[PDB]
């Protein structure tokens, strides 16, 4: 059952989404989105992306999601619909999991397969480097245009937010 680690994580990934998509109180909604983020990194790590997976923890979970929780505790004033949506979500997940595990082929918009994610991995690698790392480091040698527009947007984010929040 360790060969299907990626699929097991993806199932937990969806269940978390059904958690905060049903929209419980914001405190619990943010809690469910942290669980999905951690599971999301786990999936990316098992596909060979280590820098990308860790960037999720540092920037997404330890960054944005901290600001989300920080802003919730200060501007949120700490039902049947929630339970109804949550139960509806799990049932659809169960049936999708049930069928892809029975006949190993499901057609919903796209043709999905059920053999196992491991069957599409590359079979040959003998490099003395990390291919993912080389691509990201190319941001400075190849992505000159990307660096300029991204940096300017971040600078404008500082200017814009101060304008919006002044109130006068």
């Amino acid at each position: 059952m360790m060969l299907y680690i990626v699929f097991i994580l993806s199932v937990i990934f969806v269940m978390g989404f059904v958690g905060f998509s049903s929209k419980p109180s914001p405190i619990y909604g943010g809690l469910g989105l942290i669980v999905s983020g951690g599971v999301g990194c786990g999936i990316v790590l098992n596909f060979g992306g280590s820098f990308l997976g860790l960037m999720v923890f540092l920037i997404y979970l330890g960054g944005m999601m901290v600001v989300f929780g920080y802003t919730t505790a200060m501007a949120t004033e700490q039902n049947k619909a929630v339970l109804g949506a949550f139960v509806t979500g799990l049932l659809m997940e169960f049936f999708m999991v049930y069928y892809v595990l029975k006949d190993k082929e499901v057609e919903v918009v796209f043709e999905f397969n059920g053999l196992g994610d491991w069957v599409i991995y590359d079979t040959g690698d003998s490099g003395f480097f990390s291919e993912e790392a080389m691509g990201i480091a190319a941001l400075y040698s190849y992505g000159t245009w990307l660096v300029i527009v991204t940096g300017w947007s971040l600078l404008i984010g500082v200017v814009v937010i101060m304008e919006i929040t002044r109130g006068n």
């Binding site: 918009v109 796209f110 245009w145 990307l146 527009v149 991204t150 300017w152 947007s153 404008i156 984010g157 200017v159 814009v160 304008e163 919006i164 109130g167 006068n168």
Partner: protein, 347 residues
């Protein structure tokens, strides 16, 4: 707001739209949209009142959702073709989300409920940017991916926009809402001819921008935002009523004014493709636009509405508004029909 920061924010709105038009990569197209939405919110919040705050919120949620759908189309297109180039999409499901993402950004029906409300809650100058400049970026992408757009989807969004823009405008007294519904109606024409001749999509866009910019400029000169407040203009600036009459008649497509040229050329490019029912239905439904334009002509220029006593104090001061390019825009909005063959410069 500091004047220098106002220039910087505006140039970022332009830069976002320019990045979309010069990019051969879907990531830079998406970055262009994000830089555009980030910069335009501060000009909508500039007056610091609850209505502006509500308008900026409804705009953010709509444009944020539209951008997420667009990025989902790009990734699906990457999975099925292994490339990022800005061209025809290689999956029908990617095309639907891409076509629907752009429809939401444009404001086409039935993704239209935010255009009347956002345009109403922001100043006139912000509305002018929203209804003219913000339409360039989505139309640029449609110009490039039209070979793969679902015909029944693009023509269905076009027909609903023409209808909903027409009926919505009849029941309005606020000027900002009237232009918003007018903007929805003209979008349907631009996307109706897109599968057949994209050149006429640009011509109708160029003419619409010129005419719409003229109307907002004349409203801003007298600080008029309601039908009644516009009816005092005859007693303050008589010349400005004659210019409003001419532009309103132009927007309605009445010959021999400029606004008849796109309606004329779009009907031509659709009958060549044996499309007879749609152009007729489109042309007849456009009479709804001509009606509530004519209503403003009755209460502004063709009749003299009641005035107030304090108006006499206004006669002693001039107009200090900028009214930039107003003499040039008004002439281009009315006297360009004899130059119709010039559309070939757009090819």
């Amino acid at each position: 707001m500091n004047p220098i920061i106002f220039i910087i924010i505006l140039l970022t709105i332009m830069l976002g739209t320019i990045i979309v038009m010069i990019s051969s990569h879907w990531l830079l197209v998406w970055i262009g949209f994000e830089m555009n939405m980030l910069a335009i919110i501060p000009i909508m919040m500039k007056n610091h009142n609850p209505r502006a705050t509500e308008a900026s919120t409804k705009y953010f949620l709509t444009q944020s959702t539209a951008s997420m759908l667009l990025m989902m189309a790009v990734i699906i297109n990457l999975m099925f073709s292994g490339q990022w180039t800005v061209m025809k999409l290689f999956n029908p499901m990617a095309s639907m989300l891409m076509t629907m993402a752009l429809a939401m950004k444009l404001g086409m029906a039935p993704f239209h409920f935010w255009v009347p409300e956002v345009t109403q809650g922001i100043p006139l100058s912000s509305g002018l940017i929203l209804l003219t400049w913000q339409k360039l970026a989505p139309m640029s992408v449609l110009y490039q991916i039209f070979p793969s757009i679902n015909l029944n989807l693009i023509l269905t969004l076009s027909v609903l926009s023409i209808l909903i823009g027409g009926w919505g405008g009849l029941n309005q007294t606020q000027l900002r809402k009237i232009m918003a519904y007018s903007s929805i109606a003209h979008m349907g024409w631009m996307t109706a001819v897109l599968p057949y001749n994209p050149t006429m999509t640009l011509l109708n866009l160029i003419i619409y921008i010129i005419m719409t910019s003229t109307m907002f400029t004349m409203f801003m000169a007298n600080s008029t935002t309601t039908t009644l407040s516009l009816s005092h203009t005859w007693n303050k600036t008589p010349i400005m009523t004659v210019l409003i009459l001419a532009t309103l008649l132009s927007m309605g497509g009445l010959p021999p004014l400029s606004g008849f040229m796109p309606k004329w050329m779009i009907i031509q490019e659709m009958t060549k493709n044996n499309s007879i029912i749609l152009p007729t239905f489109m042309a007849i439904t456009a009479l709804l636009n001509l009606y509530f334009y004519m209503r403003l002509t009755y209460s502004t220029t063709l009749t003299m509405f009641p005035s107030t006593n304090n108006m006499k104090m206004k006669w002693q001061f001039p107009l200090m508004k900028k009214m930039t390019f107003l003499p040039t825009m008004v002439v281009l909005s009315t006297m360009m029909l004899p130059l119709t063959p010039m559309l070939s410069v757009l090819e």
